[PDB]
Amino acid sequence: PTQKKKSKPGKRMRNCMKIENDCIFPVMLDGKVNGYACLVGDKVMKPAHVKGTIDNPELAKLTFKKSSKYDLECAQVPVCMKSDASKFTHEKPEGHYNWHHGAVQFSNGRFTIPTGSGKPGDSGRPIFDNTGKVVAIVLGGANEGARTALSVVTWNKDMVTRITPEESVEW
Amino acid sequence: PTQKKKSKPGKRMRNCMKIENDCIFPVMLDGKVNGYACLVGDKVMKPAHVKGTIDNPELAKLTFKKSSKYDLECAQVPVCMKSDASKFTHEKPEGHYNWHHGAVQFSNGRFTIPTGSGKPGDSGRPIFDNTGKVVAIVLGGANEGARTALSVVTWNKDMVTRITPEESVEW
Numbered sequence: 001p002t003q004k005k006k007s008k009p010g011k012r013m014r015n016c017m018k019i020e021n022d023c024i025f026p027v028m029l030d031g032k033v034n035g036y037a038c039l040v041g042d043k044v045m046k047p048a049h050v051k052g053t054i055d056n057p058e059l060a061k062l063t064f065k066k067s068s069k070y071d072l073e074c075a076q077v078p079v080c081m082k083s084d085a086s087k088f089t090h091e092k093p094e095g096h097y098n099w100h101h102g103a104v105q106f107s108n109g110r111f112t113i114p115t116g117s118g119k120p121g122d123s124g125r126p127i128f129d130n131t132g133k134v135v136a137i138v139l140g141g142a143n144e145g146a147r148t149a150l151s152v153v154t155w156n157k158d159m160v161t162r163i164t165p166e167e168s169v170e171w
Numbered sequence: 172p173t174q175k176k177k178s179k180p181g182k183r184m185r186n187c188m189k190i191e192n193d194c195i196f197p198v199m200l201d202g203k204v205n206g207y208a209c210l211v212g213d214k215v216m217k218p219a220h221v222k223g224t225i226d227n228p229e230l231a232k233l234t235f236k237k238s239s240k241y242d243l244e245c246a247q248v249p250v251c252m253k254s255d256a257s258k259f260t261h262e263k264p265e266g267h268y269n270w271h272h273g274a275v276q277f278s279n280g281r282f283t284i285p286t287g288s289g290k291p292g293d294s295g296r297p298i299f300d301n302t303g304k305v306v307a308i309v310l311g312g313a314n315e316g317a318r319t320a321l322s323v324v325t326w327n328k329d330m331v332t333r334i335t336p337e338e339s340v341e342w
Contacts, residue, residue, distance in 0.1 A: 030228045 019098055021128055023086050029053040035124035039077055039085040040134040045155040047073040049139035049170060050124045070162050072153055087132050092156040095129035099138065104150070109163050111136060111150040118148025120171040127152075140170040190301055191269050194255060196226040198295065206295025210248065210256040211305045212326060218242040219310050219324055220294040220341050226256070257297060258304040263327035266300030270309055270321075281336060283320045288312055294341045298323070311339035 026033040035050035066073045104111045118141040126134035136152040151168040195207045208224040234246035297305040307325035320336035
């Protein structure tokens, strides 16, 4: 083409370029990482497949009010804690292309990655935008032999939590 | 001889430490290491100075039913795990020349090693063969003068409980 300015990166010597979250916290049961937690929205949309493994005991006892008609926990936590985790949600932008892997399409009410990318121990990872807003949580999936369908709880601006496939397993 | 005229070819890392192969796991009682466990037999035989056994957090909670009359434990874990532990016993093969340090001397019908057992937790170290198979558990010892003769409980085909050289010193 013809270029009359340069404003692309191209003057950097940077050690890091890492986007994948590290604002997460592993959560223990029998000394094994049985999931990954973070504190995303105004009332915290996490424990839902990672409520059976607990978080920490001190935390477990305070938080837990739930809607077990959805098998979801919600209840706010201090603003200081949320600052040192993930950020709140209040919308659904489609900036998400990161979760673990390089492309989750949202179409037809299911998040899909290619088949055989999805495997166990990927349960609890958030699907994150570029700003770190979590629009949906991976609870499990099923190999469909073309795609891997992902199971999620959501909380957006239209919600509809527990938007899941009808032949998914909870790993 | 048939096959190679050397045991093994050039490697920078040996599969073994010398001839021993470590696989032992510490077992706690009031914060202190009063033994080691590593699953021997048919219904499991370690405690003789300990109560409670730790080889994995998942296993410990699952296993514990007991017959408190010698301190006998009952339970059997998955076969994958069991292989990696110690081998069963009912019979006496000859090979025992390790329990800790691999130069255990056979003299006067007894196995003795030089001092170096005066630290706690030499009351539940196993006596394993050259490759390994545990017929018996080191219960204690007695100093002959600068050396330690060993007291043992066994479950081979020679029976006898509480083999004393002089007395049985539990550290």
